[PDB]
């Protein structure tokens, strides 16, 4: 009276754990992709109008 | 943090000792305590020269706090001795309270027999022991609760010292007493139970050792019922404490 000859309880446990870890990884990379450098502070800009 | 009210009890004097000491309870290691003591001691001894030269704030804060770090180190050495830990090694200063079996072979599991109590600090027999954490965590968790409660109730009593000085009798009846009964009746009671459980020899009596954490929860969520009695008339007094806290 098995669950399946292919989708055994052993395989499903591995997959849903993998799905959880992959979801956390994707969310992590989704935040990292949004790191924008604050260019304005790093590059000098000048004009003759200011003091 | 903030300037004290006029003639109010100064937070300074209690802080002199309890600040480095509460640090020492966490930062307990004789080796690290010793190294930090030497650093602070050098700043203290040379202070006449260091005082005159100009300093960056990352270094000025250290010099300003030199007498803090000195105590911060000395107490760390003391607590490190009670944890019996120097650079992650135990110290075999006294005869152990645990005796091992008479014989065993290579790779054979053994269990120690109690023959006494270690005089100062953790018994060194626990080192490298496979269930060491199961003991020390019970020790340090209970230590933290006891020290925390004692520290809180001690400083809470400064509230009374303010009210009596200002003749604010209304606050004695209004704030101090109700607050004292409330917290002493719950977490003071827990503190008493923690100390008591250590006094009773459960295995000699053959009684089941009660779970204090379950006991704490049950006196709120199911008063008047008990699994394992810590002492006679357990249920009768607990319901009284609950009613007192509610009132």
């Amino acid at each position: 009276d098995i669950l399946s000859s292919i989708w055994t309880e052993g395989l499903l446990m591995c997959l849903i754990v993998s799905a959880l870890l992959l979801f956390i990884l994707i969310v992590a990379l989704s935040w990292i992709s949004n790191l924008d450098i604050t260019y304005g502070a790093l590059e000098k800009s000048t004009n003759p109008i200011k003091k | 943090y903030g300037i004290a009210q006029y003639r109010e009890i100064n937070a300074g004097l209690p802080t002199i000792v309890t600040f480095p000491f509460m640090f020492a309870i966490m930062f307990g290691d004789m080796g690290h305590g010793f190294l930090m003591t030497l650093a602070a001691l050098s700043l203290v001894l040379n202070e006449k020269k260091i005082n005159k030269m100009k300093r960056g704030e990352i270094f000025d804060m250290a010099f300003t706090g030199r007498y803090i770090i000195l105590l911060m180190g000395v107490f760390s050495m003391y607590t490190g001795f009670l944890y019996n830990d120097i650079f992650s090694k135990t110290m075999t200063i006294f005869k152990s309270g645990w005796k091992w079996p008479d014989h065993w072979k290579k790779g054979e599991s053994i269990t120690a027999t109690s023959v006494g109590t270690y005089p100062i600090g953790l018994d060194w027999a626990w080192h490298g022991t496979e269930n060491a954490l199961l003991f020390s965590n019970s020790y340090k968790m209970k230590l933290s609760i006891l020290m925390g409660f004692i520290h809180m109730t001690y400083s809470y009593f400064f509230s009374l010292a303010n009210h009596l000085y200002f003749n604010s009798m209304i606050d004695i009846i209004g704030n101090f007493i109700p607050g004292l009964l409330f917290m002493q009746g719950i977490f003071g009671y827990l503190s008493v139970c923690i100390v008591y459980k250590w006094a009773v020899d459960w295995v000699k009596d053959g009684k089941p050792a009660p779970g204090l954490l379950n006991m704490l929860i049950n006196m709120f969520l199911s008063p008047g019922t008990i699994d394992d009695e810590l002492y006679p008339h357990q249920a009768k007094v607990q319901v009284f404490l609950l009613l007192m806290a509610l009132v």
């Binding site: - | 645990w98 053994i110 269990t111 006494g116 109590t117 490298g128 269930n131 199961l134 019970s138 004692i150």
Partner: protein
């Protein structure tokens, strides 16, 4: 031998020597001496007493398998 009364014995003498110090403390900067030393002994005692009581009637015992037979 050891018992709970061992801790009470230390508590009495620590109490005695602290209240004795309260009386003999120097006049110069009296408040700092009276507060620091007495509070230090009290807080220092608690660390020992707790660590001592925790080892009177233990509910677990050391276990290991790595110890060489001649130890």
């Amino acid at each position: 031998m050891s018992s709970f009364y061992t801790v009470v014995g230390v508590f009495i003498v620590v109490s005695a020597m602290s209240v004795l110090f309260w009386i003999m403390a120097p006049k110069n900067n009296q408040a700092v001496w009276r507060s620091t030393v007495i509070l230090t002994l009290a807080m220092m005692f608690l660390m020992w007493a707790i660590t001592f009581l925790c080892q009177l009637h233990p509910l677990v015992a050391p276990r290991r398998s790595d110890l060489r037979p001649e130890f």
